[PDB]
Amino acid sequence: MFSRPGLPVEYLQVPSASMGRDIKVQFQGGGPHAVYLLDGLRAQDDYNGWDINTPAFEEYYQSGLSVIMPVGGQSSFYTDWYQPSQSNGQNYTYKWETFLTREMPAWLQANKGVSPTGNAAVGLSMSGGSALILAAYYPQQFPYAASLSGFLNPSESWWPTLIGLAMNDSGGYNANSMWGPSSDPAWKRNDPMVQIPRLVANNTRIWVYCGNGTPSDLGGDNIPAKFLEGLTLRTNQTFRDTYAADGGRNGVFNFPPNGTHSWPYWNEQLVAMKADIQHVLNG
């Protein structure tokens, strides 16, 4: 982990009444407002990917912002599922939106003094869209959201299938148990592209990054993974175009040709957005 000695990183056990279990949370206090760092598709139950692969905590130490790294939620898309993943034996239903928007913030407010409002949600790949959705539906809690190499049009064309494939490949989770068949409204409800009107209306400050190239931490190798990576960039470009078309004016769109879908670049983006977050959240 990059949470080396000196950094006041705590490991909290936060009860989730909705999921009937305790959720581990890596936390670094540094102010009433916090940056929620969401993990990727293969989120582990011991440490958040951000701490494993980047010096995120150190980079935000003394930034005037607390850093919250929830642990776990493999292939959960940080959303509330319809039912336990049907196939891999999950014995409970993922309710990560409920955890992130109600249970965890309530806990941190009562015990740490972290404000449940005026925070930033930052996600990458799997959680890229999650961050924008959290901000779309919970503007008070998240006036700021960043998506790094996110899947921003999950309900469109190949996306439901690609997402289902990724989830199955990551812990054997079932996308159908999450948002039902692709025709289910849950897919559009959790589609950043479809929810752009919300982001515009709430004047959400959005930071959207997308690299390009394969292989990467996004995947790569074979033709299917290559298609996914290519679709990811194109969809991010369409998201930017649609956001603009819909009246959006508070976004930062970073599409550097040499940017990659990797922790080094996602970390670079996290650092680059620090000043932006500080100004928006503590300005």
From Swiss-Prot:
UniProt KW Secreted keyword: yes
Subcellular location field: Secreted
EC number: 2.3.1.122, 2.3.1.20
Domain of life per record: Bacteria
Ranges where the record places region Fibronectin-binding: 57-67
Family statement drawn from the similarity comment of this UniProt entry: Belongs to the mycobacterial A85 antigen family.
Name by which UniProt lists this protein: Diacylglycerol acyltransferase/mycolyltransferase Ag85C
Species this protein is from: Mycobacterium tuberculosis (strain CDC 1551 / Oshkosh)
